[PDB]
Design an enzyme around this catalytic site. Sequence first.
Site, PDB file in Angstrom:
ATOM      1  N   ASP A  23       0.055   3.705   1.507  1.00  0.00           N
ATOM      2  CA  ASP A  23       0.007   4.577   3.267  1.00  0.00           C
ATOM      3  C   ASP A  23       1.484   4.503   3.571  1.00  0.00           C
ATOM      4  O   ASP A  23       2.609   3.694   3.543  1.00  0.00           O
ATOM      5  CB  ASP A  23      -0.650   3.399   4.118  1.00  0.00           C
ATOM      6  CG  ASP A  23      -0.881   4.046   5.556  1.00  0.00           C
ATOM      7  OD1 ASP A  23      -2.041   3.845   5.752  1.00  0.00           O
ATOM      8  OD2 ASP A  23       0.147   4.235   6.332  1.00  0.00           O
TER       9      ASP A  23
ATOM     10  N   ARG B 224       2.765   4.930   6.262  1.00  0.00           N
ATOM     11  CA  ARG B 224       3.424   4.021   7.589  1.00  0.00           C
ATOM     12  C   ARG B 224       3.801   2.638   7.215  1.00  0.00           C
ATOM     13  O   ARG B 224       4.115   1.877   8.277  1.00  0.00           O
ATOM     14  CB  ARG B 224       2.208   4.022   8.650  1.00  0.00           C
ATOM     15  CG  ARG B 224       1.732   5.433   8.901  1.00  0.00           C
ATOM     16  CD  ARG B 224       0.375   5.477   9.870  1.00  0.00           C
ATOM     17  NE  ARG B 224      -0.695   5.123   8.878  1.00  0.00           N
ATOM     18  CZ  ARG B 224      -1.900   5.012   9.149  1.00  0.00           C
ATOM     19  NH1 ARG B 224      -2.332   5.291  10.521  1.00  0.00           N
ATOM     20  NH2 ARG B 224      -2.993   4.437   8.371  1.00  0.00           N
TER      21      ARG B 224
ATOM     22  N   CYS C 260       0.848  -1.449   0.182  1.00  0.00           N
ATOM     23  CA  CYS C 260      -0.137  -0.103  -0.105  1.00  0.00           C
ATOM     24  C   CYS C 260       0.887   1.316   0.138  1.00  0.00           C
ATOM     25  O   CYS C 260       2.010   1.406   0.506  1.00  0.00           O
ATOM     26  CB  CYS C 260      -0.831  -0.149   1.318  1.00  0.00           C
ATOM     27  SG  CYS C 260      -2.356   1.366   1.138  1.00  0.00           S
TER      28      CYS C 260
ATOM     29  N   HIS D 206      -2.067  -4.011   5.046  1.00  0.00           N
ATOM     30  CA  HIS D 206      -1.882  -3.764   6.361  1.00  0.00           C
ATOM     31  C   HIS D 206      -3.412  -3.587   6.999  1.00  0.00           C
ATOM     32  O   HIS D 206      -4.171  -3.370   6.581  1.00  0.00           O
ATOM     33  CB  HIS D 206      -0.860  -2.500   6.304  1.00  0.00           C
ATOM     34  CG  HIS D 206      -1.765  -1.396   5.847  1.00  0.00           C
ATOM     35  ND1 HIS D 206      -2.294  -0.411   6.642  1.00  0.00           N
ATOM     36  CD2 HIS D 206      -1.655  -0.876   4.468  1.00  0.00           C
ATOM     37  CE1 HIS D 206      -2.641   0.658   5.830  1.00  0.00           C
ATOM     38  NE2 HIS D 206      -2.202   0.375   4.419  1.00  0.00           N
TER      39      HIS D 206
ATOM     40  N   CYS E 134      -6.263  -0.401   6.974  1.00  0.00           N
ATOM     41  CA  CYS E 134      -5.946   0.137   5.665  1.00  0.00           C
ATOM     42  C   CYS E 134      -7.240   1.360   5.205  1.00  0.00           C
ATOM     43  O   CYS E 134      -8.495   0.871   5.459  1.00  0.00           O
ATOM     44  CB  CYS E 134      -5.875  -0.832   4.476  1.00  0.00           C
ATOM     45  SG  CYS E 134      -5.521  -0.095   2.956  1.00  0.00           S
TER      46      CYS E 134
HETATM   47  K   LIG Z   1      -0.841   7.880   4.512  1.00  0.00           K
HETATM   48 ZN   LIG Z   2      -3.482   0.946   3.073  1.00  0.00          ZN
END
Ligand SMILES: [K+]
Ligand SMILES: [Zn+2]
Length: 209
Positions: A42, A44, A40, A96, A99
């Site tokens: 993302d 993190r 992803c 993750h 999400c």
């Molecule tokens: K993010």
């Molecule tokens: Zn995600």
Amino acid sequence: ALQQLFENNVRWAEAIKQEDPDFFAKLARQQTPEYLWIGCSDARVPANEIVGMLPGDLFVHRNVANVVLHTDLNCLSVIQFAVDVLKVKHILVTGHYGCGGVRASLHNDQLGLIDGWLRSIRDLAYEYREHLEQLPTEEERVDRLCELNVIQQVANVSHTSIVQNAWHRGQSLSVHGCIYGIKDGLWKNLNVTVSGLDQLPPQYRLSPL
Ligand SMILES: [K+]
Ligand SMILES: [Zn+2]
Ligand SMILES: [K+]
């Protein structure tokens, strides 16, 4: 302010060159990662740090909610280059928990253009609605859907002719599914690894060229 990033980079590069002044020159001379990471976007979930790898070790694709679609030449071209040219030994599909992409697919708000991107996850929620309805909290439903999504993407990667043709010509390649915990920093195996044609359903198996 972008100046911080440039200054960070100058210091990072100089630090590495003190410990090893040839580090970058040597890396620049060939491309031999053993892994492709599909994860992803993302912020993190940065790939290298999470599994303690170095520049040069992980070929990487990242998109919202780590989705592998059969007509997406973006992700498919990364896979195809990784498999056919770089000859990576492992594709790591990593989703993750928590999400946002997965979470939005469980809700009814329009987010815009990304609505179309995530609709496959929506299909999965519908497909497993009887299972998800059973779970008492939303975080639980989101988290389980995050898992289901990874497992589905592993299947999608494995069904490509790209991966099947690698197996046909005797190339070692495994597709793995893992899920990362943003709450605890832990990268967990979902144990859905596929490494050969004999594991695919008949409906998905393609004949050799
Ligand atoms: K993010
Ligand atoms: Zn995600
Ligand atoms: K095989």
